[model samples]
Structures are given as C-alpha cells and as structure tokens.
Target chain A: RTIVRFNRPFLMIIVDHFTWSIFFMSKVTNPKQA
Target chain B: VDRGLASANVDFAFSLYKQLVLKAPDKNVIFSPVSISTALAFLSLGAHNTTLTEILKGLKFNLTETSEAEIHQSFQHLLRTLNQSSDELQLSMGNAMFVKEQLSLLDRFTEDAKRLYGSEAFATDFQDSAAAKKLINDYVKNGTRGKITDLIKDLDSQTMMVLVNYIFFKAKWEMPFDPQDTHQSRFYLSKKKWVMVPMMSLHHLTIPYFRDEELSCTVVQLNYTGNASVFFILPDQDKMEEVEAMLSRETLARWGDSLEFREIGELYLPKFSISRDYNLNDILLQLGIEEAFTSKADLSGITGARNLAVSQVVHKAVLDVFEEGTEASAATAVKITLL
Candidate 1:
C-alpha cells in the first residue's frame, strides 16, 4: 500500500524552517490517549 | 546569536529530554524546551555570580565561548523574531514577572529583563496568597486563550517574585488532510501489543522523506502554512532505543540536509491531542541548577537584599493535532521566595 503509518512510538520535533531551531518536542506512543 | 545560542538551546533540549524519558519511559512525553529555558534565563537576569553562571551553563551555553550580553541579546532577538504576528501563523511567546508589591527590584535588572528577555513586570502583594494566586492564574489563563484556567491551585504567601514564560502557537498545515480518509487502524504499541486508532491518510502526496538504514528510522517532514515544520521520526520496530541513543544534532542536521522529496501512494498519520504537566525542580537540580533553589543562591542582582531563591518551577504544555492544523501551548514558571 506504500502507506507510512506513524503507529509506533516516535519522536516529534517542531522547528523553524529557516534557522531550524527546535521549539516543541515529544515522544509519542498512542496519539489517541495523550 | 550566530546560530550558536540556538544550537546550545537545542542541545539542552535533548539533555532534558533524556531526563524526561527516564522519569517515565513507558508514558508519552511532551515539553517545550524553549519555554523552560526562556523562563529560567529571564530569572537569570536577577541572578549574580555563580547563580547566573549556573543557569546559562545549565542551558548548555559555554561561559567562555559566548559573552553573557551576547547570549541574552540573542535570546532577545529570538523572542522578537518569534513574536511577529502575521496571517500565516498565530504565535506569541515571552516572559512576565510578578513582584512582591513592597519589594523594590534593581532598576538595571528591570531594564535588562525588559530589553533582553522581552519580559514584562508587575507588582502584587504576595502575603495575600489567595488574591495573589488568583491574579497570577488569571494572567496565565488569558495568556494562552483559556487553554488553562485551573492549572495552578495555590501560592505561598512569602513568594516575592514569579517569572513566567508562555508560548501559544496555532498553525494550519501546508497540506490539509481529508477527514473522510481517516479510518480505524491498528497501532502497534509493540510487536505484541496493539490498539485501534484513527489514522488519517493522504493519497498521492509528494513529501520530503528520509530513511536511515544505519539508524533504522524513517523521518518525515510536515510543514505548517507558516514558517515552521514538524519532523516525525519513526524508528523501526524494536529499534527505538538504539536510534535514540545515537541521535544527535549531527544526525538531525544530516537528515534535514539529505531528505528527498518523493511521491507516495499513501501517507498515514494518527490523530491525537496530548497534554503534560510537570514540576521541573528536581529535573533542574539534576541538570546542574542547584544553587538557585538553595540557600546558596545569589539573586542579589534583583534587589539590594540577599534573601531570595527559587521556590518552585512548574510547567504545563498542551498539543493538539487534527485534520487541518496543529495547536500547541506551554507555560513555565519560576517562583522566588524570601528566605
């Protein structure tokens, strides 16, 4: 299906597109559960 | 800032991230490193000698490498640059200091806090804990557009100062997902455990993607309509631990440099909203910010008297991800008390 599922625990990082400075970050497992 | 200060702050984020994970490896983790560092650094303006050095260093700045003035000014630049209100994104962040009504702060400290940290100041009588606590809570409530009004419950009557750093961000995705394409899908908590989650899909989407065979991870870059982007890195099954151990700025810089745009038949992502609250006192202590919370603290730079220390540092963060966009808010506070 060429489907890329973010189903497992993953690291999320939010950054500025230009300078690439990180702001918010998280390690997620179940997105539905917070 | 020379990219060095931002570099330092980013590294400190990882250091704190490891600590946060160690606290509860099995639970979902979320935080705003920018808010935490900005909050503490604002208080650092009122610090002296080792107290000041401890904070800046704790944020991963090299005392010898970056001049104190340059570091503060760069943060000021970042704050100014980030607070720009445009039609693309709704984002605002800065510090607000509440002082004991009768306690006079140093004029220079006030000036520097205002000029360097984009911080605002206010006065209130903390001896009236009930009234003072309500004042602070209401301020935070409105600061984040009512995201949290009951987050804080109490305050110490002897609290002399409270330094708060807040960030409110809301941005639309460059490519919005179709809610109709979302369906219940199996999410693997592990090879053995799984649950059904609503996974949204995009068909025939051309996106930037990177897969690292060496690290066994796939990184996908999703951009907001604004100037920011979110990187979601999914490690190969059972490879999450090893990938994290080896992850660093060198790794991230390379990944961002090497990402390739590819058209995919389908891209799936789960929909979720998460919130986290933390008392970061112990975490900061372990991160080498000890004196500020102890009797050894030297915050005399704030006032002529030498009787103040950080009593507590609290943090609250919320993140929401849906079909259209992402909304995130975070608040960090450092309370100062009379000794």
Candidate 2:
C-alpha cells in the first residue's frame, strides 16, 4: 500500500530478506489493469 | 547471506540494467538479477579458459579476489536462504538442466551442478523439439505458479542442453492499500500523451524517504509483510533519463543510508502489472562476453570435449502491484548447442 505520488515514470526494485534485489524495472507505459 | 555474492549480483544487475536500457530506449525494463546470474553461474560450472573468465567477469565477479569455487558456494548459500517457505513471504527458486537424452555429462559436472547449484538434471529427447519444449515450459510455468508460460515458443532441435532458472515471489504489504480509495487518474505516457489508470491512495502514512537532489528523484521503500521490500524511485518531471543516470549500487546504498521517516499526508500510486521477456545474447556480447557464444567457447568441462557453445540466453519477468500486495516472478533459460 502506498506512495508519495508516483504518477510519472519511476524505477522499481523488489528486495529479499538480505536486501538483495529480486526484481528490477524502470516501469513502462502500458501496464495491465490494477 | 554473504554480502559479497549479493554485492556482486547487485553490481552485475545495475550494469546489465544500464545495458538493457541502452538496448531498448524508451521501453520499460524488468528483469531478475538472481535468475540470470544463477543461470550463467550454473553454466560456468562447465566452462573453461577465457569462456569461464568471460562469464564470471561479466557477472562482475573479480576472479583475482574471489575464486570460482567461492562464488559457487556463495550462490549455494544464497539459494538455501532464498528458497525457504515462510508465512509472510512466498519465495522459491530452482535451476533445472534439461540435457538431450543422447548427451552425457561428466559425472563430476552433473554432481557439482546438483550439489553446488541445487540444480536438478533431467534427460529429454531434444530431437523431439515439441515434446522437449512442452516439458520445459510446463515445468517452468508450474514452478512459478503459472505466472510464466510459453517460456520457449520454439525449441531448436540442435540444442543439446537447456538450463532454466525460475524464481517466484509473493508477499503482502505491511500497509495494504485501500481499493475503495482508488481513483481513475491520468498517467503521463510522454509529454504529449497520457492515459487513465487506477491510482491507489493512502493518507497519513509514515515511511522512510530520501530525496536526492543531484539525481532529481525521490526514493521510498515500501515494506512487505515478510523479509522483503520494494523501492520506488520517483523521478522529477521529464527527468527520467537524468534519474536513470543516477542509478548505481553506490547511489542505492547512499539512499538507504540517508533515508528519513516522515508522515506523508497523502500518497498516490498506480495499480498495475507488467510482463517482459528478453533474448540476452546481444547484451551479454556487449557486456564483454563473446567467446561463450562462438565456437571458441570452452564449455568442455561439462562434456570433457570442446563441442558445445551457448546459443541463447532467454529471460522473462512478470510483476503485479495492487491493493493487497505484489506478486512477481522471473525465469531465465540458457540454451546450449553442439559446435
């Protein structure tokens, strides 16, 4: 849940227990439905 | 978790990400560092000569500092740490080596792949391309909870071995979004184009945030229920490229070290999902890994003969963010053929 108003393009990183990144992306325009 | 392995993977991840951005500008890039690295490391088990150095260095592993055996053992520990099932997080990863029925691997190589990499070995009749394709795809799809499918649209009959790695992750947010508060908001596609999207909102949230003026972006970490989190780096208006340029392990570490907790009066984030697949051959070549793709490849450690070379390294990733939490999965497949 949440944000600080990220309407524009943003980079996303999912981290595991060790703070190791599991998935990395710089978001796209046409993402699927919510 | 061994910090060195995590550090190396992060370094390789960022480097590869920058290359991914360069390879396809203006397109969203999504990938798993662990998946691709594991696939390459598993392949390195059978690599020799410059081919071995190429792969390890491509992964940003300094062979002079860390031995190949150390890297393998580190990854082993990482796998064991990541593959555990928990109540708060559902994360699992595994490697599968599908060898052509007629192909025979050195006993030591097979055992090492299994013991060191937790890689499972399976023999398949690669000549039956359709059957081989189905078997591999089904296993991958099932392992990822069907989040990934049709991983191999086409399987080359000439392929003697296909190494596939899969990781599936699911978790709930520490603070779940309110779907009722979601509103259709406009999202900027470009300065000239925009679209309406469901935007989830939250009020009075206290979260850690860091604003890097130099990068022209704000970084925020959103925790999941378990031992995981997500960092959303929101770049300033029309400064996506500038912010992207600011990406690096150093920058991330700095952000993490400097974050401050503050009550955000209101927050709005889009609920969405993304899935992308890539043929990492050219990128790897660009990353100074060329010998492995050519006949000059020295993967003889697997077969005890210089008759095999990597043909393609394919990767696919899927991500979903919504009111409750996030579900993301990624898989990487390395196809090797007879030279």
- lDDT by residue for model 1 (B184-234), tens: 988889999888888888889888898888999998899899899998899
Stretches of model 1 off by over 4 angstroms after superposition: none
Q: Evaluate fnat for each of the predicted models and list the values in order.
A: 0.74, 0.65
lDDT of 2 by residue, B207-261 (tens): 9988888888888889999989888888888888887777788888898898999
Name the docking class for model 1: medium
- Candidate 1 colliding pairs: none
The ten-residue window of minimal lDDT in model 1 chain B covers: B145-154
DockQ of 2: 0.50
Best candidate per TM-score, number?
2
The all-Cα superposition gives candidate 1 an RMSD in Å to the true structure of 1.6
Assess each model's interface with DockQ, reporting 2 decimals per model: 0.69, 0.50
